[model samples]
Target: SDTLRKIVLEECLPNQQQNQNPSPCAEVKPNAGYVVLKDLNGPLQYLLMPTYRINGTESPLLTDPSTPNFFWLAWQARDFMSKKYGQPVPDRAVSLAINSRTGRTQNHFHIHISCIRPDVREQLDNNLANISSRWLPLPGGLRGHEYLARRVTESELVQRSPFMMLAEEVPEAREHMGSYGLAMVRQSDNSFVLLATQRNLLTLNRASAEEIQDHQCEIL
Candidate 1:
């Protein structure tokens, strides 16, 4: 995983900037520990990314209480998509997600900025009441897979890092942190719905978090 992480951070990201353009990404600056851009290998026309440069999925750079708000990064991602496609976040079935350490291709932290699958959205919404501020058993177990949901209303997500939220819910998940997946979907009311799972390698699919976000933007 470290080898792949090196390839992405060292080799690919630099080549992403073309000399003629002088790197359009250089012109944009959002906030701390963030990079918002259109990835060369992106999956869709409106695929904008706001990713963290910090290494390690469980790094304190992310979970630390003092760290910058990641929800702001999500806002930028939505803004980028809206500006590029002439579509507001509400008009699009937008979603944000991150793979569990074992589920990710690269070890470095990055959130998938994309649309939600219609079915996935439907499933998540149907289970809304079961999700709460504290972790609880999600009935039917989220597509037949054991998972947990932590609902943070309104701007509350800004106060709680997704990593910290997930860690608190599944304390054992922190021990094998790499084996967990996290996904945060925007609610219709501008609230965020956070979903996580401690992966069962034999049963759970890798990139389960990423898959729910629908990278292909099929709904678009």
Candidate 2:
């Protein structure tokens, strides 16, 4: 399971950029973010009510897609600085990891770019995208569909706002999580959580039946 989970560390990027250039991504430490999750083990994957944020607050939306749909985990923008943004990781746009077993995290880099990253917004989205590359047709014959293959142009991916709007739902499952423009996905066995730090899609977790409600307060 350890090795499989490591392999599950697939990263998803926005089809385009959301800013003109890079910028810093912190007003303070730990600015609290969240996300909602869904099931997609079938066609018409899902359809229902979802979670909500604290009125003014926000969260990421996690969902299930067949061969074409996708919801990213985090958003990342290139930061060609004096030093390498991330260490040497082959075929990985973003590399860093969170090892939940021994509490030893390898790829745990979280430096927000100077803008917002668009695309999917949860673990399910990230996981689905990683596998989707093989299932459907992508733009450049790359891993994912046109949305995943083609690197969006600056004009195509510009962020109108400075700070990303946090998803209203919180994802406190995967032992630990990270926040950036790049979508993040962490999993353990059949159980999972989808966390996010932006506003893009609507939540679909709560809309499902009891089998999918992992974090229900109504039980107790």
Candidate 3:
């Protein structure tokens, strides 16, 4: 339950204090209140987690006005991938995702930053025209799971928090934040596709937005 929370507070934060550079954790941004950890899932994969305690998608603090825009911050952390890969990871190849509560093992909130799955990329490319500024069902489900897709320009994404956008714009999501998962993928033109889906127990859909990502970064 507190596995990720303990890692940040007990391990990453303490190690960061003793040394200028912390191990296990890639970076510690104290003022921003977040830490970047190189995830074991993939060499290039990283996780952006808040220094403060906040549960996964279910946490209401995430939708609170006082909460910082963590998604925006996670997006910035994508640079870590480029630095590790020793080259610029193409925007289209990168993705950031958060799984629904039911889909995740750790209770702490973390966003997965990795390369977009090659097949997922092609699916999005094929449905680009259908995804607009408003939320709509992705023409074909991603990895056989239904998702609502929307588009946002770089400026729009930078100016607004995706959390607020999701809670305020999507009527159903406003009341059921915990039941959903979200993902953001950068398109070739610099715009982003925002994807969201809810957990479905009957259908066994865990609503893991991370399904869109390729931890191995095969697309690279």
Best by lDDT: 3
The runs of at least 3 residues in candidate 1 whose Cα sits more than 4 Å from the true structure, single-residue gaps closed, are 1-31, 40-53
Prediction 3 TM-score vs. true: 0.95
Candidates by lDDT, descending order: 3, 1, 2
- Give lDDT tens digits, candidate 1, residues 8-94: 444444545433221434222333544454544445322222233555455656666777655446655676666665656563377
lDDT of 1 at 144: 59
List, residue by residue over 46-75, the lDDT tens digit for candidate 2: 111111121111122221111111122122
Against the hidden reference, what TM-scores do the models get? Answer: 0.77, 0.18, 0.95
Clash count, candidate 1:
0
What are the lDDT scores of the predictions, listed in order? 0.60, 0.20, 0.88
Off by over 4 Å in 2: 1-136, 139-151, 159-220
Relative to the true structure, candidate 2 reaches a TM of 0.18
Ten-residue segment with the worst summed lDDT in candidate 1? 20-29
lDDT of 3 by residue, 74-95 (tens): 8899999999899988878889
Worst 10 residues of 3 by lDDT: 15-24
Candidates sorted by TM-score, best first: 3, 1, 2
